[PDB]
Write an enzyme that holds these catalytic residues in place. Structure first.
Site, PDB file in Angstrom:
ATOM      1  N   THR A  45      38.681  35.872  41.545  1.00 19.78           N
ATOM      2  CA  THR A  45      39.277  37.051  40.442  1.00 19.78           C
ATOM      3  C   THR A  45      39.928  36.798  40.339  1.00 19.78           C
ATOM      4  OG1 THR A  45      37.616  38.256  41.943  1.00 19.78           O
ATOM      5  CG2 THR A  45      39.150  39.554  40.834  1.00 19.78           C
ATOM      6  N   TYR A 135      31.325  38.718  49.055  1.00 19.22           N
ATOM      7  CA  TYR A 135      32.578  38.972  48.605  1.00 19.22           C
ATOM      8  C   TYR A 135      32.375  40.316  48.492  1.00 19.22           C
ATOM      9  CZ  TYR A 135      37.097  39.992  46.175  1.00 19.22           C
ATOM     10  OH  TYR A 135      38.384  40.563  45.996  1.00 19.22           O
ATOM     11  N   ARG A 140      36.750  47.223  42.621  1.00 15.52           N
ATOM     12  CA  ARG A 140      36.164  46.721  41.405  1.00 15.52           C
ATOM     13  C   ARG A 140      35.352  46.876  40.560  1.00 15.52           C
ATOM     14  NH1 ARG A 140      40.140  43.213  39.609  1.00 15.52           N
ATOM     15  NH2 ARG A 140      42.272  42.937  40.820  1.00 15.52           N
ATOM     16  N   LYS A 164      34.395  38.042  52.769  1.00 14.50           N
ATOM     17  CA  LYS A 164      35.400  38.128  52.247  1.00 14.50           C
ATOM     18  C   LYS A 164      35.427  39.831  52.194  1.00 14.50           C
ATOM     19  CE  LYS A 164      38.614  37.731  48.442  1.00 14.50           C
ATOM     20  NZ  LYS A 164      38.745  37.129  47.429  1.00 14.50           N
ATOM     21  N   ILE A 205      41.804  34.703  52.421  1.00 18.24           N
ATOM     22  CA  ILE A 205      41.461  34.165  51.370  1.00 18.24           C
ATOM     23  C   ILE A 205      42.236  35.369  50.439  1.00 18.24           C
ATOM     24  CG2 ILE A 205      40.342  34.292  48.899  1.00 18.24           C
ATOM     25  CD1 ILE A 205      37.798  33.753  50.249  1.00 18.24           C
TER      26      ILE A 205
END
Ligand SMILES: [Mg+2]
Ligand SMILES: [Mg+2]
Lengths: 296, 296, 296, 296
Positions: A45, A135, A140, A164, A205
C-alpha cells in the site's frame, strides 16, 4: 511453519518524471538494510501498488530481491488483489521472482464473506510454497478478516503464518494470540507498535521506518528481547511522527517526509494520490525537526 | 448537461461453467426493457466487475448496448478504477463500445484526498464526451466524495452530471440538492429509494430491480410524476426484499434470488465471492415468496 | 390513539444570573405560539433538562402549560430518565402539572437491552393516561430502541403513539412506517425534517424553531398538507442554519443564536455546558445572517 | 500526587426483594479484600449507580468504607454526574462519608465540549481534597475526554491524578502516557488489562474481578512487578470470560455469573436493566466452567 518476522518496512515507490526511479528504489532499500531492517515490503500500500503497472510490479520486486541477496534481509512482496484468480497469479508471480514471502491484503471493495475470505486465501496459499502473511486493514478494504477466519487459515494452510493488523483494535490482538499463540502477529500501525509487540507480536510492517528505520529497528528488537522499557521509550518518542505521518492518507505524508529529508528526489504521486495540503506540508516539516533522520 | 436518469438496473453477470452466460445476459436485459426500465448498468459492483477480464467487460457492454439498440433504454456502463490512468482508459473503452455514459466509482482502498478525487474525476471527465455519474459508496471504497467535491466537479466538468449515493446519509442528499439543485442525485440504496427521490433525486441504480424490475420502475416513475403516495407504497412493500438482498454482500443475495426464481441457470460466483450461508439461503427464499416475480 | 403531532419546539431554558429567567421563558413560549407552532417541549435536552432542579422542572412545565392556555398549542413535556422508577415519577409529575403528553428519552448511559427498554416504557405507559412519545437519540444515550421494540410498544401500550427519531438513519424511518404505518414518526433532526415528513412522518420536534418558528411551522404544515414542493423549499433554505446549530453540542449553538438575535438577555449555561469557541460563535453569527428572524 | 492504583473492582450491587442486600454487599467486599484487591469501587456503573437512590448511594459507600477499615484496601467511590453542581455535591458527599477518592464519569447524554469538560472536572477537583480519577467511556456517555483535556486537568488540578479508560483505543493510551507519563492510566476494559498495564498503566478497575478477584489481582501485580509473561498468561486465559461478561450490557452478565456461581442470592436488577436472554444465560454458564471461582 516458515516465517518472516522482525522489523519490516513498507517501501515507498519513488517516481521521477512519472516513471519508477529505479536508482532511487535500490538506494532506499540498501538504506533500510544498513539500519537494521529485517525485511522489506515492495509494492505494498505504501508503495502505491494500486497505481503501478504489472511490469513495474515485476521491476520493484526484482530490485528488492537483488538488493537483499547476500544479506539476512527478506523480501515480503505485496501480492494481493480483490479477485482470487489474480491474487493467485500475483503470488505465483512473486515467488517466481524470488520473493521470500508475500503479504496479501484482504480483498477490497467487493466485500467477500468470511467463507469467501477463507477460500480466497486457501487458494493463494496452495498456489505457492512460500510463507503467506494476511493483511487486515478494514478502513481501506471495507471488509474484516475475523479472528476465527485468521486462525482457521493459520491452522488449515501450512504456509499461512500470521497477520499484519491495521485495525486499531488491541482487543482483537489479544483475541488472536490468546487462542492461537503460534501465529505471528505483525503490527501494521506504527503508533501502537510497542503494545502489539508487548502482547506477543513478532514484528512490524512499518511506514515510519521509511524515515527512521534505525529507531523502528531498535524498538522491535528491544521488544523481541523483552526490554520493554527501551521499546516503550522509543514508541513514546515516536508517537508524534507516527501520528503526523497519517495527517493525510498514507503514503502521502511519508513520501512528503522522505522528500523533505532529501531521501527522494521528487515529490511525485500517481493520481488519485496527490501532494499534501500546504498546511500539512508544514505540519510534517515541523514534526521532522525533532527527530534524527539517518542519511545514506 | 446531457443526463441518464430514471429507473436503472445494476445488472448481475450470470456465469455458466465459469464463463459469462452471454445468452442469459442478453435475455436478462430484454426482461429489464420489457418491464419499464430506463437504463441498465453493465459491469458494475452487482455485476462482479472486480473479477471479470477486460474482454468480459467489453462483451457485457457490447451485449448491453446492442440489446438496448432500437429502444429508449440507455446503457450506463461501469467504468471506474482506483488508478486514474486506468479509470481514464476504461472510460474511453466504454465510450468506444457504445455506452451512453459511465458510472465511475470513487477510488477504493488507496483513500485519495478530496483534492485527489477532484483531479481523478476531472481527468476522467476530460477523457470522453459522454455523461459521467460519480459513485459514492464509502462503506466499500474507504473514502468519501464530499458534497463540496461533488458540487465542484459538477460545475467544472461538462459531462459530470450527478452522483449515485450509497451511503445511508439522507442528510448528505439534502446537502447536495440544497446547494446544487441542478445535479442528478441517483439512489444507490434500494431501501431508501423513495426518500431520496422524494427530495428531488432523479433516479435509481437498483439491485432489487434485477428480481422485480416492474416494481422498481413503477416506484421511480410514480416518484418522478410526484405521486409520492404510490411511490412510497411500493417502497414500503419492497423494504423486506430490499433488506434481505443485503443479508450478505451484494451481489451474493441477488444472484441467489435470480437463481431461486429460475432467471439464471447456475448460482456461480467468482472468488472471493461465494454462495451464501444455508441460513441466509433460506432467508432469501422465504422473503422472495411474498413478491410477484415477472418471467421472461 | 390520542396524539401530539405537527410542528413542535424543543424549548431552550434561558438563565439570568444563574436562575431560570421565568419571564423570558414565558416570552419565548408566547413567541412560539404566535408563529404557528402546534406544541412545545419544555425541559427537554434543548432545555438543559440534565442541569435543572426538579423544582425548576415544575416551574417550566407549569409556565408552558399556563402560556398555552386559550390556544391550540399542546405541552409535550420532557419526562424521561435512565432509571425506570424515576421516569415513571416524572411522567406522573408531568401529568399532575397539566402536560398534554410526555416525551420520554431512551435510558442513557446504562445501555438497557431491548427487553429492558420494553419494560421501561411499558411501566411509564401504564403510570399515566396521557400520550407518550418515545425519543431515540443513540448518539446521546449510547443505546438504540430497535424498530421491533418501538412497534411492540406502540401495539401493546395505549399511550405510546410514536417515536421522535434523532438517529441520522432514514432507513429506520422507512423500516418503522412500512411495518407499522399507524404510528407517529416525529423528526428530531432539523436538517432532514422534510425527508422524514415526506415518508409519512407527522411532525417535528425542532431546535431551529426556537430561532425560526415561522419557517419550521410552514415547512411542517406544507408537508402535512402534501405540498411537498413548498416543504422542500424551506428545508433546503434552512439547511445552513440547521447544520450550524450543531457546530457544537445542542443547545450551545441555539442559545448563542438566540442571544445574537436579542431574544434572550444573557448567554448563560449551566456547567458542564458553556459558551462556544470564538470561531463557532463567529460562524453562528454569519450563518444566522441569511435568515429573517421574527421578534416578539 | 496522592493516588489510588492497583487491582480494583467495580462492585456489583446485589438486590433482594428490590432492596439493596447490604449484608451480601459487605460479604462480597470482604471476598474482594481477601483475594488481593487493592481498592473497591462502590456505586459505579457496574454497581447500577443510575438506579440507586441517593440514600442507597450513601449506604453502599459507608458499607464499603466500613469493610475496608483496618486494611490496605481503598474505597474509590463512584461520584459522577452530567450536571456539574450535582457532581460537586456527590464528591463532597463521598469525602464526608470516608471514601479515599472518587471515580467521576464524564458527563453523559448532554455531550459537553472539551472546554466544558475542563470546567466540570476543575469544579469537582476544587470541591474536595481527595484524589479524583477521571472515567472516560464514550460508548456510554456520548462524549470523549480528549488526551489534551485529560492532560490539562492532570496538570492544573492537584488532586486529579489519572483516568480510567473504557474506549478500546490503545492508540489513545499511548498518546496519554507518552505526553504525560506521570499520570495513572487505569484500565476500564478487562480484556485489554495486560496491554494497558504493559504500556505503563498502574491498575485496573475491573468487572471480571467480581467473579475472579484472585486472577485479576495476580494479573495486575505480575504486571506491576514487570513479570509481563505471567501477567500476559492470565490475561490470555481471562479473555473468554472477559468477553462473555459483555454479551449483554454490563452489569447484566457479571450479575448473572455471580448468581450462577452462588456468590449472590438473587438475579435481580433495577429497571431498565433486566435478566439476560436464555441463550446468553447458557453462554455465560458455559464459559464460566473453565475457571476456578473462589468462594467465601
Ligand atoms: Mg539480544
Ligand atoms: Mg492461565
Amino acid at each position: 511453519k516458515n516465517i518472516i518476522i522482525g522489523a519490516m518496512t513498507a517501501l515507498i515507490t519513488p517516481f521521477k518524471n512519472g516513471k519508477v526511479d529505479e536508482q532511487s528504489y535500490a538506494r532506499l532499500i540498501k538504506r533500510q538494510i544498513e539500519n537494521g531492517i529485517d525485511a522489506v515490503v515492495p509494492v505494498g500500500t505504501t508503495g502505491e501498488s494500486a497505481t503501478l503497472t504489472h511490469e513495474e510490479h515485476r521491476t520493484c520486486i526484482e530490485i528488492a530481491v537483488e538488493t537483499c541477496k547476500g544479506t539476512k534481509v527478506k523480501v515480503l512482496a505485496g501480492a494481493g488483489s480483490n479477485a482470487t484468480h489474480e491474487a493467485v497469479g500475483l503470488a505465483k508471480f512473486a515467488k517466481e521472482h524470488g520473493a521470500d514471502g508475500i503479504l496479501s491484503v484482504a480483498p477490497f471493495y467487493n466485500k467477500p464473506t468470511q467463507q469467501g475470505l477463507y477460500e480466497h486465501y486457501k487458494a493463494i496459499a496452495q498456489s505457492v510454497d512460500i510463507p503467506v502473511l494476511l493483511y487486515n486493514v478494514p478502513g481501506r478494504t471495507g471488509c474484516e478478516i475475523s479472528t476465527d477466519t485468521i486462525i482457521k487459515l493459520f491452522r488449515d494452510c501450512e504456509n499461512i503464518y500470521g497477520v499484519k493488523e491495521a485495525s486499531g483494535n488491541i482487543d482483537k490482538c489479544v483475541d488472536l494470540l490468546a487462542h492461537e499463540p503460534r501465529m505471528m502477529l505483525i503490527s501494521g500501525e506504527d503508533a501502537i507498535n510497542y503494545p502489539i509487540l508487548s502482547n506477543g507480536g513478532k514484528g512490524v510492517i512499518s511506514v515510519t521506518s521509511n524515515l527512521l528505520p534505525d529507531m523502528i529497528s531498535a524498538l522491535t528488537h528491544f521488544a523481541l528481547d523483552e526490554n520493554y522499557k527501551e521499546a516503550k521509550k522509543i514508541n513514546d518518542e515516536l508517537y508524534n511522527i507516527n501520528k503526523i505521518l497519517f495527517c493525510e492518507s498514507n503514503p502521502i505524508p511519508i513520501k512528503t517526509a522522505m522528500y523533505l529529508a532529501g531521501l527522494i528526489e521528487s515529490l511525485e504521486f500517481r493520481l488519485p494520490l496527490c501532494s499534501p495540503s500546504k498546511e500539512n506540508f508544514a505540519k510534517i516539516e515541523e514534526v521532522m525537526k525533532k527527530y534524527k533522520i539517518k542519511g545514506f
